UniProtKB/TrEMBL annotation, chains A, B:
Protein's membrane topology: Single-pass type I membrane protein
Full protein name: Toll-like receptor 7
Organism from which the protein derives: Macaca mulatta (Rhesus macaque)
Stated family: Belongs to the Toll-like receptor family.
Keywords: Endosome, Glycoprotein, Immunity, Inflammatory response, Innate immunity, Leucine-rich repeat, Membrane, Receptor, Repeat, Signal, Transmembrane, Transmembrane helix
Places the protein is found: Endomembrane system; Endosome
């Protein structure tokens, strides 16, 4: 019971520990900075709005501001919305920030600014001006930034935001920024490394530029540098999904052998897409502490078979040599140099896109005694042959990734993976064979792999009648992803040899379920004694040879994207107890099953401990709410995206345990007279995207409403007449969380009130 | 144009040739028969409504009625809607039909009637009472039906509409119906064939009943019978998708060897699902003219290898022996008796669900000299091996169907396929291998099959880099369905050996398009010199190695379900001419491509003769209508299911050629002042399912409206005030075809008019 309603269209959080008062106005369709922002505001976010200008009046009384995030109020045309394009660039008048003596962070990215804003306070530590039109850096324009530590200037001149000229940086522009630690000049059309840079730099990003050559002294004074990224300078442009201009004569980025001598603290070196043909060992002479090295998207296929530089990297943790294939060559094998054995600290090795026909055990011998190796990624290599038993010498690994290959019996190609916008590994040893050509499996294929905990066979070509003998050696397996295959459940003994199986995914195996009159033994679960979760989504199941699925252990069943409407055809009672004997089942997802109605017997046929039931996206037109009495343990009921027109007369007379009721996206036009009357257990109600006009106190008693963790009412058809007097007052003065109050909890009428938020509604004429 | 607007909620057609006045009130949510039905009405349909009763007032003036179709006004609970269930059965008071002296047809199906309606006129020839609760036939209740020719009484006692007792038919109930030709007692729980039936019967349907035995004299007097169906009496219940009770001791339907002796005119005999183990030749002794024989869903696997009865069927056109497999037996081969060679007239032979491992050439030798054979269907047999070259001896066939098998290098199971509700074959010789396990193809696989015109490899496991050598022998092929495979377009020479290919379907081959950084040669079309149509739907294409697709012959390209939003990413101009060099292209479907906007250059990049463009289901939020000037041959533009808010100021100034404009399912709230001014080529406009409130005369000039073949305005937000005076009058008096006028061209306001049809609107108060 608030005494003064909050009409400000921003979320106001109070973090009393750090004295911070956070005002978040992100994406509120604002054309001006709203009035009434708290005077003690420390963090103000006005991101994704259409405020055309900043002036001394903008933050006049907000003297305690430590951060202003004013991003994307005039986003460049190619990066922004075409339905609501920005007409003019953001105008910043003088003395807008100079009075803010506590300002530490200022983000003005994506506003089409032509110059670095001046009159900034001396307390500023972070300045961000990405995706603007600033492509000439002058020393006089950086004088104000004396105490700056982090400076983002990238994305001011590239294909999604062109400047039509080379980027210019005056000599020693950044040299006297004595506290500068992070400098990013990525995606800027830069032609040379700016010199002299301040020796305090810890991170330097110069990737996706036009730097053809590094001078031997470009990084001579950067003895504190930890991260250096020169990627995308002389890029490898074959199959580039973005406009890509390589260096002439197919030349690499020219780096002198002594260019990194001063970088004794370097931990990360990124040389992705630099068209490199050799990696001279001399580069890493003085770099002893290097931990991450990205050499992907170069022409290093031959170098991988020699790689003498690896002898100088005993502390390297991560090495990436992906997409170094030679065009038009299909190598018979992967030639890894013996030098890989000197990478004592290596945890992750990635060599995708090398392109070779057959993987043999001895080709991985240089990796055999790398004691800290955790990930070996050889995906996207068009490997046709691989004896999986070779991985018996790789039991210590966490993931063996052979995904996207031809084995049978956006990251590397995105322009800027760090661009700013406006899984079974946890089970243990994983062998990922997903998106391969395995059409048939036999026990001998998995010999010597009894240590595996997860096997991903998703997206293979397996059209087999499994009988419980195919995975016999996989005694420790806990997770089997068999999705996107053609499983034929002729035998109820399928998967029974996987005695420790906890999760089975057989989703998207619709092939044999789509053809009429063939056997489907859905009772196969009875033999899996420790199975906790079963997924059989998108199988188009409309028939079954077994009338009951049984399990003493299963807790979760996902059965979405099937045809329970056909199995439960009215007059056919045979499958109304299909899930009844899944005695420990707690979660059942039967959404997207074309259930326009539920026959009588479905609720009585549910297993006894059912907690979360989803009947979403079914086209449900009616629902006998009283039948929820059968589900004595129901806590969550999802009826979203259906065609329901009513709520129960008494929700308490339907379920004594229901905590979360989701009714969003239905056709509800009104609530029953005593809907939530005495439903004291309800903690979450979603009635959003319905057609409710009125809500009276009898339907929504305050003794129930105040207990709610959340109440969603947005996108309804609220009629703001004098009959809505209680609802409007309650919404304005309630502590109960209701999202979208200042953006989509609106009056649709009458007249004057059409389109008006109920939070700003004044109904004084109703009490004269 | 019209002086008296039509306010009747039914469609009224006038067929002056056959002298009919057709009034169709189907599915109009009627609770009473509407007043003002034309007195000359001959055919009155009131199907799917909620009219609770019929009385002498119902058809008082309609003396010229020849047909009353009053079906499904009180559909049985298990067959009808659960959101709007019928409360009480249809009440028919006396003298409702007795005055209709020209009534020839009366359909009262699905109304929960308890007895055969009495007081029917003597002119009645067809009476239909399916899906009612009439399960006792008495001779006295049939005396009124003296001139009846067709009588449907089925579906009155079965699992979807139970009666809880056996069906009763009095002795000789139908005997004195001297003109009865068709009698259907299907799905009725009948225990014996009713006798004596009138000798004038041409068709008798007794399927899906509890008849365990046929007496030798049950059909002794039926010398005019052409169709006899006794299916589903002692059914084969393995994998039945409906409640199925077999005859005890697994006994078949017992048919004496001489039961069909009087049926000299029998053309169709259906013995589907009768658990038959033998087919005695003696059954067909006096049946010389039999044309169709259905013996599917029996236990005739052994009989197929003997089948001496086939020697007595030289005129048989269609033979079905599907789903006769022995449970738990996987035969090595198909044993077809040599007796099949005596089926001289056979055109269609179906033997699905026989279940055998290997198909060999000599197993089909009994079929070699059957000169009229057109269809050989061996689908759903779990065949693992088959030399496709064997079909060189079957060049005369139209279709060889091996669909749903395991070959590698609802019809038979529906309860009642004739239940009443309330393709490349045209190219020539087709070989259907769809839904098989072919993972790799080579030229030799298709040796001796140069005669084929269509090959369906849809839904196989082909993950190959085709290079133009795999289909070398298929010189005459015109249609290749390669959908639902894993095509890898590494080579632009794929499919080039198919020199006569007119249609290529490579839809749903998304596998290799979903993985980043691999080659995709979309320029492969250049080599296909007579290709007319290319389908590459649902491939998730977001990248391409070729910037242009080329073709001198292609007329139709389907590219729906891809990611042109990614290929045409703003700032990337490389693929804006992807379709430009498809010089003869007339139809382009680029719907479902996530195109929230179209970058500049898309329209200029279109090929010159483009006539039909679909941009449906894209989430398009804006559209520069002026760019249609580039498409000088555009005739059809589909912009349905998008988020457009406006129409062009003057459509004629955007396109001089546009004839069909589809804007249904958008967010349009108003039309421009002169929208259709001088749009002389416009013939079809769909503005349905938008949010239009008002339409003024200026937007819709009469010289343009009079050329429209159709104008769709339904499901809008029409505001029926005095400002809508022109629109309301025009809708009422126009001759332009506007569908859904009496069901979904409604006022949403103000007050009194909410929910009212604009056709029934009286605005006389606006002119006083
Ligand atoms: C087709 O006709 C048969 C009879 O020829 C109908 O079956 C009969 O149905 C009734 C009602 O379901 C059965 O009676 C009940 O039996 C149970 C069990 O003994 C008893 O507890 C009840 O009090 C009641 O007496 C009757 O036994 C059963 N007869 C046979 C021989 O099965 C059948 O329902 C009809 N089909 C349809 C679809 O209406
Ligand atoms: C990781 C990036 C992959 C890009 N390349 C690829 N994209 C796609 N789609 N498929 C590919 C399959 N392969 C293997 C391959 C390589 C070279 C040659 C041709 N060499 C012969 C000429 C004389 C020797 C044939 C090959 O396979 C049949 N590379 C592929
Ligand atoms: C047309 C309806 C098909 C119904 N049956 C079927 N439903 C489904 N899903 N898959 C099937 C695969 N097959 C072939 C088959 C038949 C019998 C036996 C068992 N016999 C062996 C004991 C010694 C011989 C094994 C078989 O394959 C492994 N029939 C199947
Ligand atoms: C309010 O602004 C301050 C200052 O810009 C933010 O402080 C940063 O918090 C992160 C952790 O989230 C630290 O890693 C940084 O070192 C802090 N920066 C400075 C300069 O102190 C703070 O996070 C902002 N709060 C919110 C919620 O926006
Ligand atoms: C990067 O800088 C180059 C120049 O170094 C820009 O290229 C020039 O662009 C103009 C306008 O298109 C042309 O008239 C010149 O001929 C180009 N010069 C050269 C050498 O190519 C380029 O546009 C800049 N990049 C971006 C994305 O703006
Ligand atoms: C109007 O009713 C007559 C009589 O019921 C229908 O006539 C049938 O037309 C079909 C198709 O030509 C014939 O096969 C039937 O034999 C005719 N029946 C009789 C009894 O003559 C006519 O089709 C109905 N018209 C419409 C459009 O409903
Ligand atoms: C591996 O590659 C190197 C060159 O990179 C070559 O010297 C060596 O002989 C190759 N060995 C094998 C086994 O291919
Ligand atoms: C696979 O390798 C194992 C050794 O780990 C060996 O026993 C087995 O025979 C090999 N099989 C094949 C097909 O090479
Ligand atoms: C298996 O791999 C697919 C990708 O091919 C991925 O979507 C899925 O999450 C993986 N399974 C698990 C359990 O990690
Ligand atoms: C399962 O099939 C394999 C051959 O694939 C066979 O060795 C095994 O005996 C079968 N299992 C049973 C229970 O017959
Ligand atoms: C599944 O049901 C069949 C009968 O249809 C039975 O033979 C089989 O043992 C059942 N399987 C399990 C694991 O209960
Ligand atoms: C689904 O049930 C699990 C317990 O089985 C619970 O952790 C989860 O919160 C439930 N989902 C919701 C939305 O409450
Ligand atoms: C609870 O609901 C049932 C069904 O609607 C009804 O019969 C019962 O009377 C209700 N309780 C009360 C107190 O009326
Ligand atoms: C074919 O089946 C019949 C019995 O139906 C048997 O007499 C005959 O020997 C069988 N021949 C072959 C080749 O299987
Ligand atoms: C397939 O049959 C043809 C005869 O038409 C023969 O030439 C060919 O060798 C056979 N192929 C195989 C794989 O047996
Ligand atoms: C190929 O078969 C599939 C069914 O497997 C069918 O949907 C498709 O229409 C067939 N292709 C043609 C061109 O008839
Ligand atoms: C295409 O593949 C076949 C089969 O591997 C091969 O014989 C043929 O030489 C290939 N074509 C070319 C042009 O390499
Ligand atoms: C497709 O383009 C490639 C170059 O990217 C070229 O080698 C090939 O000949 C082209 N194919 C056709 C059929 O034009
Ligand atoms: C126009 O082309 C579309 C496909 O883009 C097609 O579905 C439609 O039937 C065509 N209409 C006419 C009148 O040609
Ligand atoms: C559009 O209308 C203007 C004004 O009448 C005219 O100048 C122009 O030529 C027209 N363009 C087209 C494409 O009809």
């Amino acid at each position: 019971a608030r005494w003064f309603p909050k009409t400000l269209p921003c979320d106001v959080t109070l973090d009393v520990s750090k004295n911070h008062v956070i005002v978040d106005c992100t994406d509120k369709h604002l054309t001006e900075i709203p009035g009434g922002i708290p005077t003690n505001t420390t963090n103000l976010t006005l991101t994704i709005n259409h405020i055309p200008d900043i002036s001394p009046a903008s933050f006049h009384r907000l003297v305690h501001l430590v951060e202003i995030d004013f991003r994307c109020n005039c986003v460049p045309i190619r990066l922004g919305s075409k339905s609501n394009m920005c007409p003019r660039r953001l105008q910043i008048k003088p003395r807008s920030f100079s009075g803010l003596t506590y300002l530490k962070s200022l983000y003005l990215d994506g506003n089409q600014l032509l110059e670095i804003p001046q009159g900034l306070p001396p307390s500023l530590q972070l300045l961000s001006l990405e995706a603007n039109n600033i492509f000439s850096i002058r020393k006089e324009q950086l004088t104000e930034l004396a105490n700056i530590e982090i400076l983002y200037l990238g994305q001011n001149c590239y294909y999604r935001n062109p400047c039509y000229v080379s980027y210019s940086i005056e000599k020693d522009a950044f040299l006297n920024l004595t506290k500068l630690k992070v400098l990013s000049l990525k995606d800027n059309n830069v032609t040379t490394v700016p010199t002299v840079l301040p020796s305090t730099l810890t991170e330097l990003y110069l990737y996706n530029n036009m730097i053809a050559e590094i001078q031997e002294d470009d990084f001579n004074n950067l003895n504190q540098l930890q991260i250096l990224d020169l990627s995308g300078n002389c890029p490898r442009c074959y199959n580039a999904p973005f406009p890509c201009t390589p260096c002439k004569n197919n030349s690499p980025l020219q780096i002198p052998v002594n260019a990194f001598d001063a970088l004794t603290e370097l931990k990360v070196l990124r040389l992705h897409s630099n068209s490199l043909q050799h990696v001279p060992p001399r580069w890493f002479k003085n770099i002893n502490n290097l931990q991450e090295l990205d050499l992907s998207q170069n022409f290093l296929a031959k170098e991988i078979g020699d790689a003498k530089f690896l002898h100088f990297l005993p502390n390297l943790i991560q090495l990436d040599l992906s997409f170094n294939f030679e065009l038009q060559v299909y190598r018979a094998s992967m030639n890894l140099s013996q030098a890989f054995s000197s990478l004592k600290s290596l945890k992750i090795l990635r060599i995708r896109g090398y392109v070779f026909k057959e993987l043999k055990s001895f080709q991985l011998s240089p990796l055999h005694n790398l004691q800290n190796l955790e990930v070996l990624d050889l995906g996207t290599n068009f490997i046709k042959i691989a004896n999986l038993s070779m991985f018996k010498q790789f039991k210590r690994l966490k993931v063996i990734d052979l995904s996207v290959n031809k084995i049978s019996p956006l990251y590397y190609f995105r322009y800027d993976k760090y661009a700013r916008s406006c899984s079974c590994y946890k089970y243990g040893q994983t062998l990922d064979l997903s998106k391969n050509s395995i059409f048939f499996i036999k026990s001998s294929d998995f010999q010597h792999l009894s240590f595996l905990k997860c096997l991903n066979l998703s997206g293979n070509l397996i059209s087999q009648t499994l009988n419980g003998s195919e995975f016999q050696p996989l005694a420790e397996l806990r997770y089997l992803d068999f999705s996107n295959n053609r499983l034929d459940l002729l035998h109820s003994t399928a998967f029974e040899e996987l005695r420790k199986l906890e999760v089975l995914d057989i989703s998207s195996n619709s092939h044999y379920f789509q053809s009429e009159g063939i056997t489907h033994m859905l009772n196969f679960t009875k033999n899996l004694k420790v199975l906790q979760k079963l997924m059989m989504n998108d199988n188009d199941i409309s028939s079954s040879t077994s009338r009951t699925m049984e399990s003493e252990s299963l807790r979760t069943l996902e059965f979405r994207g099937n045809h329970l409407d056909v199995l439960w055809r009215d007059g056919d009672n045979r499958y109304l107890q299909l899930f009844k004997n899944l005695l420990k089942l707690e979660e059942l997802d039967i959404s997207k099953n074309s259930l326009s109605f539920l026959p009588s017997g479905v609720f009585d046929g549910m297993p006894p401990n059912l907690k979360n039931l989803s009947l979403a996206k079914n086209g449900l037109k009616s629902f006998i709410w009283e039948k929820l009495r059968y589900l004595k343990n129901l806590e969550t009921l999802d009826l979203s995206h259906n065609q329901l027109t009513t709520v129960p007369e008494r929700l308490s007379n339907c379920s004594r345990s229901l905590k979360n009721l989701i009714l969003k996206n239905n056709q509800i036009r009104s609530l029953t007279k005593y809907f939530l009357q005495d439903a004291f257990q309800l903690r979450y109600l979603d009635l959003s995207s319905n057609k409710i006009q009125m809500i009276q106190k009898t339907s929504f008693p305050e003794n129930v409403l105040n207990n709610l963790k959340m109440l969603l009412l947005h996108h309804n058809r609220f009629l703001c007449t004098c009959d809505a007097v209680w609802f409007v007052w309650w919404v304005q003065h309630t502590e109960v969380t209701i999202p979208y109050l200042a953006t989509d909890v609106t009056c649709v009428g009458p007249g004057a009130h059409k389109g008006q938020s109920v939070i700003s509604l004044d109904l004084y004429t109703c009490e004269l």
